[PDB]
Design a binder for this molecule. Sequence first.
Ligand SMILES: *[C@@H]1O[C@H](CO)[C@@H](O[C@@H]2O[C@H](CO)[C@@H](O)[C@H](O)[C@H]2NC(C)=O)[C@H](O)[C@H]1NC(C)=O
Ligand SMILES: *[C@@H]1O[C@H](CO)[C@@H](O[C@@H]2O[C@H](CO)[C@@H](O)[C@H](O)[C@H]2NC(C)=O)[C@H](O)[C@H]1NC(C)=O
Ligand SMILES: *[C@@H]1O[C@H](CO)[C@@H](O[C@@H]2O[C@H](CO)[C@@H](O)[C@H](O)[C@H]2NC(C)=O)[C@H](O)[C@H]1NC(C)=O
Ligand SMILES: *[C@@H]1O[C@H](CO)[C@@H](O[C@@H]2O[C@H](CO)[C@@H](O)[C@H](O)[C@H]2NC(C)=O)[C@H](O)[C@H]1NC(C)=O
Ligand SMILES: *[C@@H]1O[C@H](CO)[C@@H](O[C@@H]2O[C@H](CO)[C@@H](O)[C@H](O)[C@H]2NC(C)=O)[C@H](O)[C@H]1NC(C)=O
Ligand SMILES: *[C@@H]1O[C@H](CO)[C@@H](O[C@@H]2O[C@H](CO)[C@@H](O)[C@H](O)[C@H]2NC(C)=O)[C@H](O)[C@H]1NC(C)=O
Ligand SMILES: *[C@@H]1O[C@H](CO)[C@@H](O[C@@H]2O[C@H](CO)[C@@H](O)[C@H](O)[C@H]2NC(C)=O)[C@H](O)[C@H]1NC(C)=O
Ligand SMILES: *[C@@H]1O[C@H](CO)[C@@H](O)[C@H](O)[C@H]1NC(C)=O
Ligand SMILES: *[C@@H]1O[C@H](CO)[C@@H](O)[C@H](O)[C@H]1NC(C)=O
Ligand SMILES: *[C@@H]1O[C@H](CO)[C@@H](O)[C@H](O)[C@H]1NC(C)=O
Ligand SMILES: *[C@@H]1O[C@H](CO)[C@@H](O)[C@H](O)[C@H]1NC(C)=O
Ligand SMILES: *[C@@H]1O[C@H](CO)[C@@H](O)[C@H](O)[C@H]1NC(C)=O
Ligand SMILES: *[C@@H]1O[C@H](CO)[C@@H](O)[C@H](O)[C@H]1NC(C)=O
Ligand SMILES: *[C@@H]1O[C@H](CO)[C@@H](O)[C@H](O)[C@H]1NC(C)=O
Ligand SMILES: *[C@@H]1O[C@H](CO)[C@@H](O)[C@H](O)[C@H]1NC(C)=O
Ligand SMILES: *[C@@H]1O[C@H](CO)[C@@H](O)[C@H](O)[C@H]1NC(C)=O
Ligand SMILES: *[C@@H]1O[C@H](CO)[C@@H](O)[C@H](O)[C@H]1NC(C)=O
Lengths: 212, 412, 419, 148, 50
Amino acid sequence: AYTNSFTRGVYYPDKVFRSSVLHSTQDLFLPFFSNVTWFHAIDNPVLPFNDGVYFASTEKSNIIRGWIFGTTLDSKTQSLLIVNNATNVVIKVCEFQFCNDPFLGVNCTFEYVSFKNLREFVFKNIDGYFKIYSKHTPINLVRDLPQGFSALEPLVDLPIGINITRFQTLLALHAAYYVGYLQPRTFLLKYNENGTITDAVDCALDPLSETK
Amino acid sequence: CTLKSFTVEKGIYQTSNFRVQPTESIVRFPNINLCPFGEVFNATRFASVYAWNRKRISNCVADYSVLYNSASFSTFKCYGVSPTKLNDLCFTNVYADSFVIRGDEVRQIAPGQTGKIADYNYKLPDDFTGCVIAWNSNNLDSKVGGNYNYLYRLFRKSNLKPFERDISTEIYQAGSTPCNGVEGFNCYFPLQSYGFQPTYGVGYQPYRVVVLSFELLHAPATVCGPKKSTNLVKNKCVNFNFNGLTGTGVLTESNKKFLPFQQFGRDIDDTTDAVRDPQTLEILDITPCSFGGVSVITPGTNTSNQVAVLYQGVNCTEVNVFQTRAGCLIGAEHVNNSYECDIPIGAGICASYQTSQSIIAYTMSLGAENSVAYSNNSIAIPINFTISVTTEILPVSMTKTSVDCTMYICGD
Amino acid sequence: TMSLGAENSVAYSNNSIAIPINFTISVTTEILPVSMTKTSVDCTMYICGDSTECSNLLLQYGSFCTQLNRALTGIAVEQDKNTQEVFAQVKQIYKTPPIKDFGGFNFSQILPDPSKPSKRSFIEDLLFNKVTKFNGLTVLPPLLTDEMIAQYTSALLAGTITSGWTFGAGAALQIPFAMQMAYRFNGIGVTQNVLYENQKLIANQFNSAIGKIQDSLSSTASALGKLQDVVNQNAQALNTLVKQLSSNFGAISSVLNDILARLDKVEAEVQIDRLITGRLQSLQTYVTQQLIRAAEIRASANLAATKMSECVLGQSKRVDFCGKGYHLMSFPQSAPHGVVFLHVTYVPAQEKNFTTAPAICHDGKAHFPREGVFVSNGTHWFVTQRNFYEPQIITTHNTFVSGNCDVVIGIVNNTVYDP
Amino acid sequence: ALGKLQDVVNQNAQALNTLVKQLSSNFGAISSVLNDILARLDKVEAEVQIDRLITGRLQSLQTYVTQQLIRAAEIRASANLAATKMSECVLGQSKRVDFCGKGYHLMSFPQSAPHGVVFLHVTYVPAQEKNFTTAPAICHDGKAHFPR
Amino acid sequence: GTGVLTESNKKFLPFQQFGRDIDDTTDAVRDPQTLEILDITPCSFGGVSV
Ligand SMILES: *[C@@H]1O[C@H](CO)[C@@H](O[C@@H]2O[C@H](CO)[C@@H](O)[C@H](O)[C@H]2NC(C)=O)[C@H](O)[C@H]1NC(C)=O
Ligand SMILES: *[C@@H]1O[C@H](CO)[C@@H](O[C@@H]2O[C@H](CO)[C@@H](O)[C@H](O)[C@H]2NC(C)=O)[C@H](O)[C@H]1NC(C)=O
Ligand SMILES: *[C@@H]1O[C@H](CO)[C@@H](O[C@@H]2O[C@H](CO)[C@@H](O)[C@H](O)[C@H]2NC(C)=O)[C@H](O)[C@H]1NC(C)=O
Ligand SMILES: *[C@@H]1O[C@H](CO)[C@@H](O[C@@H]2O[C@H](CO)[C@@H](O)[C@H](O)[C@H]2NC(C)=O)[C@H](O)[C@H]1NC(C)=O
Ligand SMILES: *[C@@H]1O[C@H](CO)[C@@H](O[C@@H]2O[C@H](CO)[C@@H](O)[C@H](O)[C@H]2NC(C)=O)[C@H](O)[C@H]1NC(C)=O
Ligand SMILES: *[C@@H]1O[C@H](CO)[C@@H](O[C@@H]2O[C@H](CO)[C@@H](O)[C@H](O)[C@H]2NC(C)=O)[C@H](O)[C@H]1NC(C)=O
Ligand SMILES: *[C@@H]1O[C@H](CO)[C@@H](O[C@@H]2O[C@H](CO)[C@@H](O)[C@H](O)[C@H]2NC(C)=O)[C@H](O)[C@H]1NC(C)=O
Ligand SMILES: *[C@@H]1O[C@H](CO)[C@@H](O)[C@H](O)[C@H]1NC(C)=O
Ligand SMILES: *[C@@H]1O[C@H](CO)[C@@H](O)[C@H](O)[C@H]1NC(C)=O
Ligand SMILES: *[C@@H]1O[C@H](CO)[C@@H](O)[C@H](O)[C@H]1NC(C)=O
Ligand SMILES: *[C@@H]1O[C@H](CO)[C@@H](O)[C@H](O)[C@H]1NC(C)=O
Ligand SMILES: *[C@@H]1O[C@H](CO)[C@@H](O)[C@H](O)[C@H]1NC(C)=O
Ligand SMILES: *[C@@H]1O[C@H](CO)[C@@H](O)[C@H](O)[C@H]1NC(C)=O
Ligand SMILES: *[C@@H]1O[C@H](CO)[C@@H](O)[C@H](O)[C@H]1NC(C)=O
Ligand SMILES: *[C@@H]1O[C@H](CO)[C@@H](O)[C@H](O)[C@H]1NC(C)=O
Ligand SMILES: *[C@@H]1O[C@H](CO)[C@@H](O)[C@H](O)[C@H]1NC(C)=O
Ligand SMILES: *[C@@H]1O[C@H](CO)[C@@H](O)[C@H](O)[C@H]1NC(C)=O
């Protein structure tokens, strides 16, 4: 199944405050009006990672509660794992033989801890440092991602030094999610008076955007 | 001295620039761990060069002089930083890469180099920023009968990219022979052991290397020199250093809504405009120290050596004293009237001499006011005339210079 | 493919003339830039960020730096000269009487308005409302403030209304405005009784034409485009000069303090000379482009100063110089970094075609018109002036004799009256 | 203060004095005297220093020619105005206000000067106003009469 | 250097060995073997064109 991403997947490109300015930046972004793949949770196939992932989901009580990243995923290499249990967020890199599809039942190379809504995330791995950005918003469309704008805020940056080519989400067991791939693009970003990014242009989408 | 003359004519002359000097130097760093470089440089055993070991260094204060002062090191080459400066700096993270290597081969551990270690064991980026430390390790790493535990890659299909690493033992192909996973004519195992014996000559002896890569960014620093912080100062011209960001200016509290992850702030033209204090976490706006120009206002020295000064664009609190819209004006008797302009100052202000022994400054006269005697049936007609001769001067040409470009540049 | 205009085979014939039965007074707006912002840039403060380790390298280039400040100072001084050449043409600050008895013409939108905190006219406030980094750079104020430029465009206009041509030639000599306009009609070759016989209509056409200037300037964004373009070009040139401080030029970094904070002197000087080399070419490029751009503004200030003298202090005979038609008069309005001229013009209208002949035969003499043309409506022959149809009986006063009937091609037979 | 001609002498003299001074500067070489580099360093040792002199001496000569091309364009704009005042003020009688002195123009006379020209513009200026009552027209036998 | 040498009236003070031009180069000298002062002038008066 497929959907148009519209203008979703913008994030703050660096840790610098700016305001009332049209900044321009080149980075891995989800292209405007890209064609992105839709999945129902009634499954979690292994998916390619390419250069980075935009991931989004819509479930009534959060069924998507983690991810595996790596190349084999099964911990026969250093495999990154992320899970949240509504008390903590728990993050690991491990080679111990945990299960091949470890749904949340309702070497420790690194470790760290900390349709009612749309939940959005961006995952990227430049220099082997695993970066996570996110947003949550009360929007209630079931089929497609909602046409509109919001900027994803950086949560986490893990200096793991590790290779990834595939990923797989983890489900709560005893609801839908969308996946799209980042590409190296130039953007123009509109920073508001209060420093929020409130609009953007994809400078390679079409001749009008290249003019802007 | 500006005009290269002992006599100066009536006018306004931009002689010098003025700027406010900084009063004090402010140093700010996180209140954070004397750094575990000892756990790298004094480790009992180092890696094989084909399988080099990287340690992340972070969240620490590092006295690099413990390294660069020591006689224990045979080489300390450094690129994009000079090693005596490292105690003043701050970095996001540092990566320490460590191994044993044959002593002759150490010359390959630099940016832009080529040779079997650089090509197939450990490749630096050619835009590296970091230091390479090396020492003779013969008494640590050589042994009687030879130490075989240390190896290098002799063969690969293709060279390493910067900080690429390769573990594989699979058979190399040196010709047309298909190797099928076994040695033979032009088919060989890709790794060789050094076998270090203490009898070997210095170029054949084992050496230890540590390479420090500095993660220099405008992101928050987690590795820093031992340099101590000062207290903070506000609303005053100071020199400053935040996490190794040196600058000069006035520091002031501000309303800028930094989001919780944001560390620095910037202007429309991409200058640093604000920071958050690494200890206090307050947002401080930065504005440059005040400056402008020193336009000296003079009648001719053939009339008088008395002078006035305009601190151009400056406010008089930052330098009789009179605040014009053009800047702070300093002299005496800057008195309220109007006259035609003698010397211009700007924004309708002009200045002129009184021989009562003073330079006036005044708002300029545009001319005498005249209500014309108009009414709808009155005309004025001239009873008489005057023939007037008006001299107009115009430039028409200028001196026909020419320059021999070869004789000017090279002098024959 | 673009169209050059409507095609027109005009109805030429060897004996046909067209003469306008009526006229339009038209007022049209001409806008000229006169000056530009007086920037300056301290070459040492721009290049070296005011760092002594860099300044002692910059001295190796010698007098390269002081001649950039000489150039920008010459450009800045001539902006005050350009503003003076245009507005300061009037020797005394004339003002109008309190009563506005100008013969039915209504200058209330053109003259000053003391309701405003700066005493600009109604139309000058439309103009001033439509026209729209801190380290090396500096912006100097102009010598004349807009409140002083508005006193010149007030005097340079109260003289025109009360005294016409005369306040340019010497002392202002008062004349009633309805009579001033009669000698401006007389200057375009229209007999002065055409004004006095049509004075209400002519004043209504003038007042209505000034009303339409409020609407054009209130509505239309491109109207002041020549002034806004001069503001935009200088802003785009400064933005380029400042953004070039971020350029790397082949150093380890573009931030001069971050070179000095990482490298020791003999290693740092090699990086700093790359920044000095690029920052000096970055500033020489700006000063060269400003010296050329200032010559375009000066050539416009010299034009604006001659439209001021010839159109405002006079009655121009030069075609299309003071607007498109037979020029009568012009009024200056100030604008941000420019001047605006309201060119009052006579335009002929409601054309009618008549039979014509070069000369008229009587007693074998040929008669030629002193002023104007012969015309016929069929049954009769008349003299008229050229630019407005006023027919008169042909007499030995409105005609002069030469030669005889045999000489002239297309001569015609009609009796000339002896009064 | 009759300075328009002396200001053109001063600018061209100041531009050449600056062009000659620029030979004394090092531009980052060991010396500004080219013979003292050649008389101290052996060929390939010296060419690295001499290229700093050549780069700075090109850039300072090319700065002079560029500013002279701009100064020459304003002298030509002034020579076109002087050529126009010769034609319209000397060879004729101008009707153009303030082009040709102030007051109504009668004549001009051209005098030569160093690098320039001087026009002695002769003008009529009206000089003793008197007030009078005035009217557009005279009514006589019901006819309106207007003045020629 | 290279030029035309002419013995000249520029009365150097006893400590002064040279006289100088605006590019800092030599305009006049004292001879290393005599108290003679020489003006130095350029050949062709600074070359010439053809
Ligand atoms: C022409 O008439 C006017 C108005 O009656 C005269 O102007 C006034 O003259 C007196 C005495 O010199 C002044 O105090 C007033 O200030 C003048 N009023 C104005 C409005 O200017 C004028 O003197 C008369 N004569 C001439 C030769 O112009
Ligand atoms: C001259 O023109 C002005 C502006 O068109 C006229 O002023 C208006 O007059 C009316 C009379 O009822 C007032 O209510 C308005 O407030 C005035 N201003 C505007 C902007 O409309 C003026 O009447 C005209 N005539 C004269 C003799 O001045
Ligand atoms: C000359 O043209 C003017 C318009 O430019 C004509 O004036 C208008 O005439 C109509 C009809 O009489 C009136 O309703 C308007 O009010 C008039 N306009 C003005 C501004 O007064 C005029 O009639 C024409 N005259 C001739 C002789 O053709
Ligand atoms: C003004 O122009 C009209 C239009 O051309 C003339 O009318 C023509 O007159 C000729 C005879 O002279 C006829 O042959 C045509 O048929 C007429 N009509 C057209 C439509 O051309 C008129 O004669 C001209 N008036 C004067 C006084 O010259
Ligand atoms: C144009 O032609 C007409 C022809 O009718 C002229 O008017 C006639 O003139 C005679 C002598 O003055 C009178 O007896 C007639 O009664 C007039 N007729 C009309 C209809 O008025 C007329 O004079 C000529 N055109 C002009 C502008 O005068
Ligand atoms: C204007 O042009 C017409 C032709 O377009 C001339 O008319 C001719 O006049 C001669 C007079 O001897 C006659 O022989 C012809 O038969 C006429 N031709 C036509 C077609 O009418 C007319 O004469 C010209 N006017 C003048 C003053 O030369
Ligand atoms: C204009 O009128 C004159 C007479 O005033 C005409 O000339 C005469 O024409 C007749 C008939 O051709 C001749 O017999 C006479 O010899 C001519 N001369 C004189 C002095 O009478 C002339 O033809 C007329 N021309 C036009 C164009 O109407
Ligand atoms: C997205 O791309 C796939 C490519 O096979 C296509 O089948 C699908 O129809 C596309 N969706 C849209 C909305 O264009
Ligand atoms: C990442 O792993 C894949 C095997 O899954 C390998 O082909 C690829 O070369 C690796 N990339 C890097 C940069 O190590
Ligand atoms: C941990 O790493 C070693 C060496 O890479 C490997 O032999 C071992 O199997 C890993 N641990 C697990 C639990 O697989
Ligand atoms: C910006 O902040 C102000 C002050 O808190 C607030 O009133 C306003 O709604 C904010 N606007 C935006 C676009 O964020
Ligand atoms: C390594 O060992 C020496 C032994 O004298 C000690 O002084 C030093 O502090 C240790 N650490 C480093 C980084 O040299
Ligand atoms: C040091 O760190 C703590 C972290 O809680 C901070 O609250 C404190 O203000 C800092 N110390 C000083 C003296 O500011
Ligand atoms: C100095 O003053 C005197 C008297 O005013 C005058 O004659 C002389 O020319 C002046 N000299 C200069 C160099 O201005
Ligand atoms: C001058 O500076 C003082 C102190 O900063 C301030 O109170 C005053 O308003 C300033 N005035 C002007 C005209 O800048
Ligand atoms: C002060 O000077 C102004 C002009 O600058 C003038 O209008 C005003 O009358 C003067 N005040 C006094 C008391 O003289
Ligand atoms: C040596 O030089 C001195 C310089 O004063 C001169 O007087 C003398 O004649 C010279 N003698 C010889 C033998 O060259």
